[PDB]
Amino acid sequence: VVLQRRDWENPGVTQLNRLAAHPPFASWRNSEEARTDRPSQQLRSLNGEWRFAWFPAPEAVPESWLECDLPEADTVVVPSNWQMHGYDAPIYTNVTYPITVNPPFVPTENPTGCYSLTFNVDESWLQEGQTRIIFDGVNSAFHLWCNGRWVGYGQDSRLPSEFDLSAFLRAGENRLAVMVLRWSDGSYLEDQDMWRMSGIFRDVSLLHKPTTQISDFHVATRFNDDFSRAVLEAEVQMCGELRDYLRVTVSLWQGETQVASGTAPFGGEIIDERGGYADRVTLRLNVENPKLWSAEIPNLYRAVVELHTADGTLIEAEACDVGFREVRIENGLLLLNGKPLLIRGVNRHEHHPLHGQVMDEQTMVQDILLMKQNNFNAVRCSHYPNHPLWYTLCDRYGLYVVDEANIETHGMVPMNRLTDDPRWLPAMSERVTRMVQRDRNHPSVIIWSLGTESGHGANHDALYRWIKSVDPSRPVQYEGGGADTTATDIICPMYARVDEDQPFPAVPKWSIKKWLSLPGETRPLILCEYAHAMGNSLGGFAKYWQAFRQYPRLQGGFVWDWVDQSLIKYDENGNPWSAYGGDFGDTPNDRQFCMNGLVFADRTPHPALTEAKHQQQFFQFRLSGQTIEVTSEYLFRHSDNELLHWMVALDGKPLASGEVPLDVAPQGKQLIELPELPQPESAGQLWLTVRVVQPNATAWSEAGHISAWQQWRLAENLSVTLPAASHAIPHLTTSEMDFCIELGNKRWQFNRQSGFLSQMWIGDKKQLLTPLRDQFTRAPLDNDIGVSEATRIDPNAWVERWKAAGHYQAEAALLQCTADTLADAVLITTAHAWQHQGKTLFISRKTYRIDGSGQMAITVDVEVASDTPHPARIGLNCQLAQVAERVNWLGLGPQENYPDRLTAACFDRWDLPLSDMYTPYVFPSENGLRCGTRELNYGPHQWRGDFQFNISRYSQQQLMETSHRHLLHAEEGTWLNIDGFHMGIGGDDSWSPSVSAEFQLSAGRYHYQLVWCQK
Amino acid sequence: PNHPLWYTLCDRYGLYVVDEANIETHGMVPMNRLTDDPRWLPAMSERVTRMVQRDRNHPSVIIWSLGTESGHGANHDALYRWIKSVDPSRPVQYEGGGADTTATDIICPMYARVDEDQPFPAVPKWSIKKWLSLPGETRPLILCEYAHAMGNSLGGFAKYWQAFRQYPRLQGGFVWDWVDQSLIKYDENGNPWSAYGGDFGDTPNDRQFCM
Amino acid sequence: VVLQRRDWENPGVTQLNRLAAHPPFASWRNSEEARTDRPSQQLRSLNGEWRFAWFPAPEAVPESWLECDLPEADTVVVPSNWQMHGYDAPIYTNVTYPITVNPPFVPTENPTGCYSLTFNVDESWLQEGQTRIIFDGVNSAFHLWCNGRWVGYGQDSRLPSEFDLSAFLRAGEN
Ligand SMILES: O=C1O[C@H](CO)[C@H](O)[C@H](O)[C@H]1O
Ligand SMILES: [Mg+2]
Ligand SMILES: [Mg+2]
Ligand SMILES: [Mg+2]
Ligand code: NA
Ligand code: NA
Ligand code: NA
Ligand code: NA
Ligand code: NA
């Protein structure tokens, strides 16, 4: 009947014989083991080596497989995605469905994973009680057999499917057969922008419960006005035979101390004309001065739920961690424990570069640590319920969680075609209701989400109300249909900009500041997605945080996103490389658009992470005279693990430093008076830097962890002393093709046909491999290219405007090249025009002054045609012959920083290996820029001025021609790009121009000056 | 939902209609055991949604009902909101769980009395005059059932109508009910007689309570 | 698979292959007929004399009934309640369910009404367009076959269940 019914092409069948959803169970038979959360003899893992065979369709599966192991099958580890063992290709598509849109049907060619396990069951498990199997995650649908007999069927890839195996099992050896389908009608609700994989990718377990059992329990905590008193309310349900001797005890523990306890027989209050629930009981425990849970101090208690007889014989115990906290929206503000939150959030998919969508504790812990170390306090489960351990870890480490139903129908036209259809209400309801039933006792979950990108349909309204009715403790949000529909308690837009309206028809994205005050609007605004961190991105991040801090009802947002969804492939030599869309033969695909993370797949930070850390700081600073004002943004905790280190330096040379303990109340202020600083012995700019340091290790950070910093310019003494007059006078030599200048062991050559410096000599060793030429282009960033889908060739994108205007094609045309001998110098004057098909794009006018001290002063004045698209940069580039080990600069750093992403960078003297001056974005682009640089040192060379630079073994040309970072090859010398000016990188989104007007190079006329010398 | 012709005739002759979903779980213990269970939401939703989809163009239909005697479950709230979203032109009413829950736009009690309170635990039937002015209450009151017309009955009918006329927000009600549910049986001579519960060998039965 | 699935003991299955619900249709091919609400040639009634047999359970239904009229069956008027034709007793109960309260299960002794009809369809309906069958009320659940082939299943006693018969119909007797 299984092949005949085709349950995987019927949205009215989402399960068969599946048990009811419930909070995490372990069926402890000892209360102390429940209290301490130790392992339970009644909960076994079936994880490990299973048997697996791949088939192109369920019709290709032999009947013998149900009762006997296939000899051709392989032994594979479970949990796994079968794409990660190479049985078929993972597919990366964003919006467009990986299957033809013909609901409820899927392709007849539907990859089928046949899993099986031969395993033991002890006789004691079968002599009494109930033995069930739990599949925490099967993608996307499956039938289950046990000992050759059909058990049931399940859909929804991201929540546990449980089945009663009591009547199916024998003492001794037993065999499970699991037929997993890659595609089902469930897939229509699973159109997340991620790799499309399949298999048994989450834990498999066996759970033994007694016949008379705890079948459900809900924990609620309510508070008085000042949170000095709480009532813990615990509703407990049983299954089995009802009896007068039955009792439930809920006890609450803080460490080894029992704080409160209540005991009652079964039988709820009368609720209607037919009485009440005889199979339910509600316990109420008073708790004076509860320790409150927050992401700042994750105070937890332990609730133990004992099912027992009147005289104390235990039947079973369940338990959970309890966090006493209230979440409510009042007067337009989201309040936690009566205080308005500021969400420093990030979206986090479950992704591993080797294991695919299988999650392990180590990876989860690594993520949480990195998130907290970088000043995140919140996470969004984009876009499905997570591995169950995730919530336990967020409970214990302290992160706010948006728990989100596994519903996305992005690729439908229009987006709400299914979600407005009552025929799809049952499938949708189970994704929402079974999530709430599983996760409702986790304190870390503060907000429910109805899913993502599924338009706004009547089904959303129905399910919104269901949650509000079933769990009044948490707000419900949902972004679809314009982010402010009747199905959301919070205005939760994606990539709405700070000041700029994007007034799309029907679903406009208003400036977030504007959105709050639209006539009749009163709700809080928290972006469910913002600051798209794809490649070289997070330009404009500081603008969001300034607005968040200024506007009470702007309460933050969740960055998109945490980790690049790249996957490891191996080349012919067996060396690993990072792969994206299309690299597995998957087609259609959306290329690099799966890589939007603040960290690489292996959790190495992108440069943008530090910009997020700095903007998300919990301490704010002001300077007035000798006084630093420190303001705490903590809502609950005092600064009891913080000291302020301060340092004053003169152009990188340390002058004075000290330490002061921080003693700041939540939302409080502390004034720190700096000692009288000694006056500088020379010219230059004094800089004050402050860092907040955590002396002690925490659960989430090491001793000496830096949590916050800030810099200010102090006194400046401009240099008024002229350089010591030189005896020597540089000599000019003139040929038809060159102007050469010589001074001691130094020589400069200017090509009279090109008009550029073609060579320089130290001794008589050549310094250049390529001439020093103007550059007005950059290897395009992902933000420059501006595509969310591989098929789109968008004329509006920056890269396309540059290409169409001929910026990449423009050839320098020489207008002037003259040489004059001065009293103590040689002056070379040049002028070039860059034209494309008769149009003058740019004019560059330069002077090079070479004096007797060996310094070459370059003055550059550029004209940019007002009607050409604003250029990516205004600078010079050359390939140096030198390959040196180190780069030393006085400027902003140490990490990569761009004009609209430089707030985290500090001004100082930095020294790094050359390789650190390149950022290995998996899709190569312009990278490694450092701004506000007054001095750069590389080998024998020094450049001085006020410029931005990048320095690497890769030319802009190679970077723009190369699609993968592992395909890059170090070129002969060192490519140097020195920019007078450089365009913003943007990032408000990555599929439309996102660079703010103040960071575009639109001034028309540009001036910069550089001194090049040998040190 | 009735035979489709009923709505056509009510349109043309002129009667106001409460169109009601085919959902009643009276015999459950407690009454909301199914209607508060998410497993039964799909079956319940089709009884509501497919009614609205059929009858939403009939002018005679002025109010939707979520069914009767099924307590008050979270499934009622979901479906209440579904209707309000899909068809804002008609109020939604539902009596279960005490006649004034979050799943009803109209206080719609059954057999609430004019002056006399019946303060049952959980689901009290207040005096209708008193019900209207309970703290915070602002909704209209229309009894979905009153004046049980069983046998020699309708004593005190005038008392309802005096109150309906005096109180603006007491906007009437629906008598229980129109027609006796008696069935024709025939005796030895082939003479017809009116039969009720039990007269077909049906057991358990509730006798004349169908009339 | 019909007897094996027991769709009538599963609240997750309320229908199979049932068409979307909609307001009353008549598919007029003349605008003046639509305006005046006169009969439509495209809306036929199948009310009248049908064949009927009673069984104590669906397991008792002979497989031959799918493709051939039962000789022991009676000719009855439809629409009708079969209790009113004396096939079994109507039950009057108020609150207490007529069956043991054990959701989603019903008694094994489940009175089964086997209705059948032989009918002709005019030629032009076979060549073009979509032909559906509408059951305005069936109490309480039913499976449907057309020319021996299974069509679908429906619940809810008080709303129409509609099924596309286009791929099932043939020239002559159906
Ligand atoms: O709006 C979105 O933009 C992201 C683009 O990377 C990603 O597709 C998210 O899943 C989606 O919610
Ligand atoms: Mg299905
Ligand atoms: Mg999407
Ligand atoms: Mg059913
Ligand atoms: Na704010
Ligand atoms: Na993406
Ligand atoms: Na590139
Ligand atoms: Na009145
Ligand atoms: Na009655």
Q: How far apart are CA C129 and CA B187, in angstroms?
A: 53
Q: How far apart are CA A364 and CA A389, in angstroms?
A: 8
Contact (CB, 8 A) for A952 and A975: yes
Q: Would an 8 Å CB–CB cutoff place A885 in contact with chain B?
A: no
DSSP tag of A193: S
The residue whose C-alpha atom lies closest to atom 7 belonging to ligand 1 is: A193
Position A228, amino acid: S
All chains having 3 or more CB pairs closer than 8 angstroms to chain A? B, C
Contact (CB, 8 A) for A270 and B124: no
Position A131, amino acid: T
Contact (CB, 8 A) for A529 and A383: no
Closest by CA position to C45, among listed C143, C168, C152, C133: C133
Phi and psi based region of residue A620 (left: phi greater than 0; alpha: psi -120 to 50; beta: remaining): beta
The stretches of C59-136 forming alpha helices (DSSP H) are 124-127
* Residue carrying structure tokens 């803080």: A254
CB under 8 A, 24+ apart: contacts of A55-59:
A55/A111, A55/A112, A55/A113, A55/A114, A56/A109, A56/A110, A56/A111, A56/A112, A57/A108, A57/A109, A57/A110, A57/A111, A57/A112, A58/A3, A58/A8, A58/A110, A58/A112, A58/A179, A58/A181, A59/A3
Alpha-carbon gap: A386 to the closest alpha carbon of chain B (Å): 21
Question: What DSSP letter does each residue of A82-94 carry, written as one string?
Answer: GGGGTSS--EEES
Q: What angle do CA A984, A986, A991 make, to 5 degrees?
A: 140
HSE-up (13 A, CA, CB side) for residue A907: 20
Give C-chain residues touching A4 at CB under 8 angstroms.
1
Alpha-carbon gap: C10 to the closest alpha carbon of chain A (Å): 9
Position A262, amino acid: G
Give A-chain residues touching C1 at CB under 8 angstroms.
1, 4-5
A596-631: b (≥16 Cβ within 10 Å) or e:
bbbbbbebebbbbbbbbbbbbbbbebebeeeebebe
Cis check: omega of the bond before C124, within 30 degrees of 0? no
Closest by CA position to A706, among listed A563, A904, A930: A904
Cα separation values, A922 from A572, A600, A816, Å? 19, 9, 42
Residue A367 host element (H or E):
helix A361-373
Q: Are residues A679 and A540 in the same domain?
A: no
Residues 6+ apart with CB under 8 A from A498: A511, A512, A513, A540, A543, A544, A546, A547
Q: How far apart are CA B9 and CA B21, in angstroms?
A: 20
Position A517, amino acid: S
Contact (CB, 8 A) for A346 and A558: yes
Contact (CB, 8 A) for A657 and A647: yes
Residue A395's φ and ψ, nearest 5 degrees, are -55, -45
- If contacts are CB pairs under 8 Å, which of residues 1-20 in chain C contact chain B? 11-12, 14-15, 20
Dihedral over Cα of A350, A353, A355, A361: its sign: negative
Cα separation values, A19 from A283, A389, B85, Å? 25, 21, 32
Contact (CB, 8 A) for A910 and A888: yes
Tell me which residues have their CB closer than 6 angstroms to ligand 1.
Answer: A 94, 192-193, 382-383, 452-453, 494, 529, 560, 596
Count helices and strands (H / E) in chain B. 5, 7
Phi and psi based region of residue A331 (left: phi greater than 0; alpha: psi -120 to 50; beta: remaining): left
DSSP tag of B89: T
Q: What is the largest CA-CA distance in chain A?
A: 112
Other CB atoms closer than 10 Å to residue A290's CB: what's the count? 25
Domain boundary among A305, A325, A345: A325
Q: How far apart are CA A157 and CA A190, in angstroms?
A: 8
Contact (CB, 8 A) for B108 and B63: no
Q: Are residues A598 and A480 in the same domain?
A: yes
Q: Do the bridges between strand A627-632 and strand A619-624 make them parallel or antiparallel, or are there none, so unpaired?
A: antiparallel
Q: Which residues pair with B175 in a beta bridge?
A: B146
Position C71, amino acid: P
Contact (CB, 8 A) for A240 and A211: yes
The stretches of A414-534 forming alpha helices (DSSP H) are 425-439, 458-470, 512-516
Q: Would an 8 Å CB–CB cutoff place C97 in contact with chain B?
A: yes
Q: What angle do CA A952, A953, A955 make, to 5 degrees?
A: 90
Q: How far apart are CA C172 and CA B73, in angstroms?
A: 52
Question: What DSSP letter does each residue of B118-182 carry, written as one string?
Answer: B--SSS-B--HHHHHTSTT----EEEEEES---SS--TTHHHHHHHHHH-TTEEEEEES-SS---
Cα separation values, B85 from A100, A418, A425, A430, A764, Å? 31, 16, 14, 20, 83
Contact (CB, 8 A) for B147 and B154: yes
Burial class (CB in 10 A: 0-12, 13-18, 19+), A387: buried
Q: Do the bridges between strand A343-347 and strand A378-380 make them parallel or antiparallel, or are there none, so unpaired?
A: parallel
Contact (CB, 8 A) for A791 and A93: no
Contact (CB, 8 A) for A163 and A103: no
Position A423, amino acid: R
Q: Which residues pair with A447 in a beta bridge?
A: A402
Helices A425-439 & B41-55, crossing angle to 10 degrees? 140
Per DSSP, the three-state class of A466 is helix
Q: Would an 8 Å CB–CB cutoff place A661 in contact with chain C?
A: no
Residues 6+ apart with CB under 8 A from B188: none
Burial class (CB in 10 A: 0-12, 13-18, 19+), A1013: middle
Dihedral over Cα of A47, A50, A54, A60: its sign: negative
Which is the catalytic residue, given A162, A404, A453, A935?
A: A453
Q: How far apart are CA A626 and CA A660, in angstroms?
A: 14
| Cα A938 to the center of its chain, rounded Å | 35
* Residue carrying structure tokens 């400069």: A748
Residue A883's φ and ψ, nearest 5 degrees, are -115, 110
Q: Are residues A579 and A640 in the same domain?
A: no
| Cα C150 to the center of its chain, rounded Å | 12
Other CB atoms closer than 10 Å to residue C42's CB: what's the count? 13
Q: Are residues A548 and A451 in the same domain?
A: yes
Residue-level length of chain B: 211
**What six digits make up the tokens of B89?**
């032109």
Q: How far apart are CA A526 and CA A79, in angstroms?
A: 35
**What six digits make up the tokens of B31?**
């009454």
**What six digits make up the tokens of A356?**
């695919």
Residue A562 host element (H or E):
none
Q: Would an 8 Å CB–CB cutoff place A661 in contact with chain B?
A: no
Contact (CB, 8 A) for A1012 and A939: no
Interface test with A, best of C6, C7, C9, C13 (most A CBs within 10 A): C13
Domain region containing A379: 326-616
**What six digits make up the tokens of A597?**
């993370």
Contact (CB, 8 A) for A928 and A951: yes
Domain boundary among A210, A244, A261: A210
Q: Which residues pair with A283 in a beta bridge?
A: A234
Residue A521 host element (H or E):
none
Closest by CA position to A184, among listed A80, A110, A89, A88: A110
Cα separation values, A581 from A195, A447, A589, A783, Å? 8, 32, 5, 17
Contact (CB, 8 A) for A632 and A665: yes
Q: Are residues A200 and A215 in the same domain?
A: no
Torsion of CA C68, C70, C75, C76, to 10 degrees: -90
Domain boundary among A171, A187, A210: A210
Q: Which residues pair with A889 in a beta bridge?
A: A910, A936
Closest by CA position to A220, among listed A234, A237, A236: A234
Cis check: omega of the bond before A414, within 30 degrees of 0? yes
Question: Do C94 and B196 count as a contact with CB atoms less than 8 A apart?
Answer: no
**What six digits make up the tokens of A60?**
């290709």
Q: Are residues A86 and A221 in the same domain?
A: no
Contact (CB, 8 A) for A984 and A995: yes
Torsion of CA C169, C171, C173, C174, to 10 degrees: 0
Cα separation values, C49 from A939, C73, C88, C114, C117, Å? 104, 12, 20, 14, 8
Q: Would an 8 Å CB–CB cutoff place C103 in contact with chain B?
A: yes
Contact (CB, 8 A) for A434 and A216: no
**What six digits make up the tokens of B63?**
């109010």
- Of A429, A458, A468, which is closest to B42 when you measure between CB atoms? A429
Q: Is A453 a catalytic residue?
A: yes
Alpha-carbon gap: B148 to the closest alpha carbon of chain C (Å): 15
Q: How far apart are CA A788 and CA A618, in angstroms?
A: 34
Burial class (CB in 10 A: 0-12, 13-18, 19+), A325: buried
Residues 6+ apart with CB under 8 A from B206: B197, C92, C93, C94, C96
Residues 6+ apart with CB under 8 A from A231: A221, A222, A223, A284, A285, A286, A287
Closest by CA position to B53, among listed C24, C22, A421: C22
Closest by CA position to C159, among listed A741, B49, A604, A143: B49
Q: Is B69 a catalytic residue?
A: yes
Torsion of CA B40, B43, B49, B55, to 10 degrees: -130
DSSP tag of A849: E
Residues 6+ apart with CB under 8 A from B51: B1, B19, B20, B21, B22, B64, C159
Cα separation values, A218 from A208, A234, A395, A796, A972, Å? 21, 6, 16, 53, 67
Q: Are residues A711 and A803 in the same domain?
A: no
Contact (CB, 8 A) for A287 and A259: yes
Closest by CA position to B71, among listed B92, B48, B95, B47: B95
Q: How far apart are CA A805 and CA A800, in angstroms?
A: 8
Q: Would an 8 Å CB–CB cutoff place C86 in contact with chain B?
A: no
Q: Which residues pair with A250 in a beta bridge?
A: A262, A305
Interface test with B, best of C92, C105, C155, C159 (most B CBs within 10 A): C92
Contact (CB, 8 A) for A543 and A996: yes
Position C131, amino acid: T
Which structural technique was applied? X-ray
**What six digits make up the tokens of A310?**
């009147």
Cα separation values, A798 from A567, A872, A995, Å? 29, 9, 9
Q: Are residues A604 and A712 in the same domain?
A: no
Closest by CA position to A877, among listed A780, A772, A722: A772
Q: Given in angstroms, what resolution was this structure solved at?
A: 2.0
CATH of the domain at A452: 3.20.20.80
CATH of the domain at A662: 2.60.40.10
Q: Are residues A515 and A560 in the same domain?
A: yes
Q: How far apart are CA B7 and CA B51, in angstroms?
A: 12
* For ligand 1, mutation pick of A453, A538, A562 (most atoms within 8 Å of CB): A453
Residue-level length of chain C: 174
The total of structural domains in chain C comes to 1
List the beta strands (DSSP E) in C56-107. Answer: 74-78
Interface test with C, best of B46, B55, B150 (most C CBs within 10 A): B46
Residue C131's φ and ψ, nearest 5 degrees, are -110, 115
| Cα A436 to the center of its chain, rounded Å | 24
CATH of the domain at C42: 2.60.120.260
List the beta strands (DSSP E) in A744-810. Answer: 746-751, 757-762, 765-766, 773-775
3-state helix, strand, coil in chain A (%, to 5): 15, 40, 45
Question: Do A273 and B123 count as a contact with CB atoms less than 8 A apart?
Answer: yes
Closest-CA residue of chain A to C1: A1
Phi and psi based region of residue C39 (left: phi greater than 0; alpha: psi -120 to 50; beta: remaining): beta
Contact (CB, 8 A) for B109 and B139: no
Position A662, amino acid: L
Per DSSP, the three-state class of A726 is coil
**What six digits make up the tokens of A993?**
């121009």
Q: How far apart are CA A561 and CA A623, in angstroms?
A: 34
Cα separation values, A371 from A376, A566, A610, A988, Å? 5, 19, 11, 21
**What six digits make up the tokens of A543?**
């603008």
Q: Are residues A668 and A734 in the same domain?
A: no
Q: Which residues pair with A936 in a beta bridge?
A: A889, A943
